[PDB]
Nucleic acid binder design. Structure first.
Ligand SMILES: [Mg+2]
Ligand SMILES: [Mg+2]
Ligand SMILES: [Mg+2]
Ligand SMILES: [Mg+2]
Ligand SMILES: [Mg+2]
Ligand SMILES: [Mg+2]
Ligand SMILES: [Mg+2]
Ligand SMILES: [Mg+2]
Ligand SMILES: [Mg+2]
Ligand SMILES: [Mg+2]
Ligand SMILES: [Mg+2]
Ligand SMILES: [Mg+2]
Ligand SMILES: [Mg+2]
Ligand SMILES: [Mg+2]
Ligand SMILES: [Mg+2]
Ligand SMILES: [Mg+2]
Ligand SMILES: [Mg+2]
Ligand SMILES: [Mg+2]
Ligand SMILES: [Mg+2]
Ligand SMILES: [Mg+2]
Ligand SMILES: [Mg+2]
Ligand SMILES: [Mg+2]
Ligand SMILES: [Mg+2]
Lengths: 129, 150, 141
RNA sequence: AGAAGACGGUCGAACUUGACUAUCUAGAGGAAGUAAAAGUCGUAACAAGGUUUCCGUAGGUGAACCUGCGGAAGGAUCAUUA
RNA sequence: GGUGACCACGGGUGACGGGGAAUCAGGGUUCGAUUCCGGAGAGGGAGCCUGAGAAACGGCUACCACAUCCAAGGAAGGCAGCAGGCGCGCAAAUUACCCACUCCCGACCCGGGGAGGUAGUGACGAAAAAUAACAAUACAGGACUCUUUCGAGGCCCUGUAAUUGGAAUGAGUCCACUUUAAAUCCUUUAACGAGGAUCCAUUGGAGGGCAAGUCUGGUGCCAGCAGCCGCGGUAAUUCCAGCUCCAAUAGCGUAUAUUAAAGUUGCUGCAGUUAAAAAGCUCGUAGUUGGAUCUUGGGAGCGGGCGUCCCCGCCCUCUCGGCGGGGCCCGAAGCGUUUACUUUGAAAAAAUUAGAGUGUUCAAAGCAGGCCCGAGCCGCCUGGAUACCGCAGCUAGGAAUAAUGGAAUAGGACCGCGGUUCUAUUUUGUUGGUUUUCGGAACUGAGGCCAUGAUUAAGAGGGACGGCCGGGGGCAUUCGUAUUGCGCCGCUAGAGGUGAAAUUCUUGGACCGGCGCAAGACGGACCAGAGCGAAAGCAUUUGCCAAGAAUGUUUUCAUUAAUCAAGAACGAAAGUCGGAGGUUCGAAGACGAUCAGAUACCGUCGUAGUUCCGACCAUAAACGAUGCCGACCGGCGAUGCGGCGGCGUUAUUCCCAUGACCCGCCGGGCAGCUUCCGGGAAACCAAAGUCUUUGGGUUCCGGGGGGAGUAUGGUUGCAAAGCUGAAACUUAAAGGAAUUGACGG
């Protein structure tokens, strides 16, 4: 059954991006999905997105700007510390110039650079570059 | 997909987005509650009560009309069965299957379906035990089922 | 596929140590039967006494007589066959000599066209076979 | 004040018997498996391999193998007509 | 009672534990007997004396095993302390000097110390570093240059041979000093000490991998080389040699353990259609994993610049606030759950590692050192850092992610008012009578108030309900022709079988034709890349029994779920046991053919079986050679089921429906065609895709080919056999997909 709504959202976005679709619909919406898409939005990898509100778990329509290479997920939410964050960076990000690792910390959901800036670790959610 | 079948049917109910009571519905909360009370006294399961109510009295959703579910209303007044309806129907089906088997033992298919139904009964009973609906020592037995249901 | 849960480490570790018995190197190094069967008994070299000088036919595509010695190891008293590896060193070898014997090069496996020979002679009568071949020192008469 | 020595108690080496348990090891003879090669008998598999091949099972034969029953195509048919 | 699949108990360990070592993207994999810490032991056990401390062994007692002396009556032992032997082995050093250093013991500045220091052997290993440098002639080379090849020199750089040809030095001899307990060595310094500076560099190689010869001579599939491919049968770039080259160099080769290479153990990070491989199928407990949902927006100058960036300040309560009665303040108690997680701090031996400083002559190292002396410098300036130290435990911040709970038969929260039992203290200061609701704790009743208290109803699941649907299953029933046999009737010499025959049945009527009867099988054609079932499988009619998917649902419960060790149900055919029944077919078997043979293929019979009932067995190329659940990613035409719409045709009737067609849509299926979605070794696959841009959940399972699905042990079975399941040994390939050819009865 569906056990990782974030993983399904990220795979759907990845497939639509590889097909060149201008928009894509993620059927189950979550707060983590909204926050993940928000950090992608702020970095510019996607455009505007809409949260269709049904009285169930809502849906999301995101606009793809065509500048996304991969937006995968790290399904076992590992405990990452500031001492071993850079090993995750080397293992996941294509280069040190660009790319982001998203992790949920007690200060909120953020990317790895902001997490390092405010000196906190957390649980890795996924990555996008 | 289905728990005990290789089927992946999608047939469900699509509740409308508007929780508001229709303007053409004149029944109010207490009237619908008394209608439920008399249907339950007639001896109908909550599913049948909802079906009858929607088919004849024009009520869409009892919860949307009264603020509570049918089982909640029946529990609140005090005329709901101690055995949950779905569990009751499951034991009833198992009783029928076992009664058929004792006369037609060569029905290997019926023995297989009996195993499936018993598994569903035990899983449902486990859930009810954890939710304290059933007593912690409530045991389903192939001998006591016929006495428990009807 | 494989499990990825946050607390599946017991299953992962048990599966690794269960599947590690399925490759030849680990089984050989951790069961002990190969060490028991090894005539050297886990040693790099071993000393023995020459019992007989024998010739072994090479494999099929080649055609030659490889000169070997039947050797009884002074420890554990096992009989092996050791190749005398040079042009005329079998003449340096004679009966009942204390020969040092090493492996042939690939870890208890036959080498080249020589069938079933896993060992080679390094020294004879406590003087190096290479020295005898090069003529650096003569046999102790 | 007191030594030798004695009864009993307790730890208890060591010996004998019996049980269990780990390795190691001899053995008349038997039956396999490899390797060697140049032997003998046939030709079972590869082509429709000259009886299509193979799987499971059972029986039988100098030997590969043969045959019955059900199956597969990895077949020699992706097809056979109102 | 206690402990166990969250692996107890047992067994093994070529297991002392740790700090640490090797390898070195990251992650890891191996090694730690070994100088520091801790433990144990002193031939194996056992028991004790003394002593603060011992179950001490350079203490004692006894036994077991070794072993010393003896006048045979006795007596004496414990080097896994330093040396040194034997033995074992592939494998490891002097029966040396000294308490001078570091420390320890003692009654003690004074003695002792095989602790320890020193030297000896020492290519374990690590650091530095000789074996030559220069100048001038020749003969070459350079953008060389002068005239624009020809000749030379106002230049630069190699190599070859020479009275060259005279400079420089150690390696060694060896005076002295120095070092040191005595010394040795190193460092100094006299004197000798180099022209084959013969004061002599080696170990492995020269086909490929892999740097270097198609040189010469011998051998001739021998000798041998060769880790692997391979070389060698007379001109061998591979053997044996000479020469010449190549690699590293005072070191190089070899054997063996181990690490990288190995993404060939795959957590990061492997595979499972065909290469090795997914259980025959389903249930199911542990285990693992689990949908969405509960505070977000708005504030004040400081402010990563209201400079609409934002250091950032966010515009819990109650008790004396310690600076019986001040606002001039910040201390005492609890959290409006418990964790997981993250950050911080403490505590984490040294050595080792990283690393700071410091010219050890550089370096490995070491923990030292430097400064001015004009000689009085009657001494000054320093260092001996820091980092890391896992997991577990302690502390203080954060509250996103994940689990966990609070009020549903209210036994609910909060404000009080009743009514109930005790008590440190009182001062209604002479004790005594004490009043103490005194202060707060004991039990319990009637109220008010809480907006009084249930998130939604998952393109999750379960259940109900409606109309259907289906070779789904069980029981009963019915029918069909065919086959075989029987009973009659008819005419006839053949009939049967084959490639040809033959065995076989036949003037006793075989074969054939007709009518009946009986039995046992099997349900043709319709019948399909159609349906149903978890698979195995399922096909005459009718009835009965339960079951089921899908579709429809503004019905119900509300996470009840996915996959699953152990355990279980069902499982083609064959096979086993018992009873029925035995028509056809037909293992075995016989016979006839065929053939060189023919134990077969072909034919005539024919046993078990094939059929049913009961009990076993649990295996198939049980196949889609292809786990399940979930999400996404093209197009098209069909088909089965259900539902929803629509021109029309048809069936009946006077009209709608309701059936058969026609055109669509939706959902669940069995599939097909096409596609540069993408993948893959390709064949091919819309899954075998979404995979180095590698992580949705979870189960099983492979690790070169054989040996081998074998041996042994256990377990199941009446048996046949099934399940679980190695090793020795052997081998350089075995395999997969495609291509070209060659061949094909
Ligand atoms: Mg015999
Ligand atoms: Mg054959
Ligand atoms: Mg054949
Ligand atoms: Mg083929
Ligand atoms: Mg040990
Ligand atoms: Mg140690
Ligand atoms: Mg120690
Ligand atoms: Mg004392
Ligand atoms: Mg001791
Ligand atoms: Mg002792
Ligand atoms: Mg020299
Ligand atoms: Mg040579
Ligand atoms: Mg390695
Ligand atoms: Mg592999
Ligand atoms: Mg295969
Ligand atoms: Mg479970
Ligand atoms: Mg969740
Ligand atoms: Mg005939
Ligand atoms: Mg059967
Ligand atoms: Mg029978
Ligand atoms: Mg027959
Ligand atoms: Mg899974
Ligand atoms: Mg293998």
């Amino acid at each position: 059954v569906r056990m990782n709504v974030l993983a399904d959202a990220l795979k759907s976005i990845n497939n639509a991006e590889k097909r060149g679709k201008r928009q894509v619909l993620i059927r189950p919406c979550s707060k983590v999905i909204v926050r993940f898409l928000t950090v992608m939005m702020k970095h510019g990898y996607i455009g505007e997105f809409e949260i269709i509100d049904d009285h169930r778990a809502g849906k999301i329509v995101v606009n793809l700007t065509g500048r996304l290479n991969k937006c995968g997920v790290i399904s076992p939410r590992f405990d990452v510390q500031l001492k071993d964050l850079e090993k995750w960076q080397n293992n996941l990000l294509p280069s040190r110039q660009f790319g982001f690792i998203v992790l949920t910390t007690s200060a909120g959901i953020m990317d790895h650079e902001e997490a390092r800036r405010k000196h906190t670790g957390g649980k890795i959610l996924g990555f996008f570059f | 997909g289905r728990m005990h079948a290789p089927g992946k049917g999608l047939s469900q109910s699509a509740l409308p987005y508007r929780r508001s009571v229709p303007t053409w519905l004149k029944l109010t909360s207490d009237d619908v509650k008394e209608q439920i009370y008399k249907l339950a006294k007639k001896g109908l399961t909550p599913s049948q009560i909802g079906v009858i109510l929607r088919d004849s009295h024009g009520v869409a959703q009892v919860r949307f009309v009264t603020g509570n579910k049918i089982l909640r209303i029946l529990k609140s007044k005090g005329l709901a069965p101690d055995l949950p309806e779905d569990l009751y129907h499951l034991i009833k089906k198992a009783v029928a299957v076992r009664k058929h088997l004792e006369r037609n033992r060569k029905d290997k298919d019926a023995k297989f379906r009996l195993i499936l139904i018993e598994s569903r009964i035990h899983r449902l009973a486990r859930y009810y035990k954890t939710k304290r609906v059933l007593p912690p020592n409530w045991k389903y037995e192939s001998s006591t089922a016929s006495a428990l249901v009807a | 596929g494989k499990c990825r849960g946050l607390r599946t480490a017991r299953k992962l570790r048990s599966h690794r140590r269960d599947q590690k018995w399925h490759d030849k190197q680990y089984k050989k190094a951790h069961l002990g039967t190969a060490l028991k069967a090894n005539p050297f008994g886990g040693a790099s070299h071993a000393k023995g006494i020459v019992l007989e000088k024998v010739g072994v036919e090479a494999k099929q595509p080649n055609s030659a007589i490889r000169k070997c010695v039947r050797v009884q190891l002074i420890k554990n008293g096992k009989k092996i066959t050791a190749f005398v590896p040079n042009d005329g060193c079998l003449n340096f070898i004679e009966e009942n000599d204390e020969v040092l014997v090493a492996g042939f090069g690939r870890k208890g496996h036959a080498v080249g066209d020589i069938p079933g020979v896993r060992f080679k002679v390094v020294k004879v009568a406590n003087v190096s076979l290479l020295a005898l071949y090069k003529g650096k020192k003569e046999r102790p008469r």
